[PDB]
Amino acid sequence: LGDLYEEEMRELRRQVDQLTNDKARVEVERDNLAEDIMRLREKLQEEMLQREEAENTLQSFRQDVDNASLARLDLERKVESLQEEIAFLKKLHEEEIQELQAQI
Amino acid sequence: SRLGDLYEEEMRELRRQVDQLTNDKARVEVERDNLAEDIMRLREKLQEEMLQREEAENTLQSFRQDVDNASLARLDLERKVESLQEEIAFLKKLHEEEIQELQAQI
Helix, strand or coil, X not given: CHHHHHHHHHHHHHHHHHHHHHHHHHHHHHHHXXXXXXXXXXXXXXXXXXXXXXXXXXXXXXXXXXXXXXXXXXXXXXXXXXXXXXXXXXXXXXXXXXXXXXXX | CCCHHHHHHXXXXXXXXXXXXXXXXXXXXXXHHHHHHHHXXXXXXXXXXXXXXXXHHHHHHHHHHHHHHHHHHHHHHHHHHHHXXXXXXXXXXXXXXXXXXXXXXX
């Protein structure tokens, strides 16, 4: 009867209400994750700039470390060189004077 | 004697909402899913940048130490180069005088 219409409409008004509360529920979830995603992308755009700057500094600083290391080697050698010269002087001085006990 | 018309209109407007809502909601679910996904992918990226960056800062702090240890060792060597240059000149002078002491022996 007129009953089928009321029953087919009881059914529909029910679905529309389910779906309406669900579309509501899911909209809230999305609105939420959309905030998180914004907070995050920023915190990350941030870290990127720090990480990058950090690596850049470390790039031209490797040069400085190399150069300081070599400057210290260039001296460790200048010194060793002076020592071989002094070690020779003495071999020579010492000799250059035995050659005057002959010819006293 | 028509009641079909009493409902035909109110009914087609419900069965239409049901279809709209269904579509509307299905689309909000894709976005919401995408978000969950994007967030997770961002977080993994975050850890990876923090990691990389802490590695660059640690490495550069070690290099700072290195450079500071070379400086103190350079000043040292520069002195020991001076001292050795003086010891050579002195060594020489002493010897020249010592062979000049052996000149009176003629």
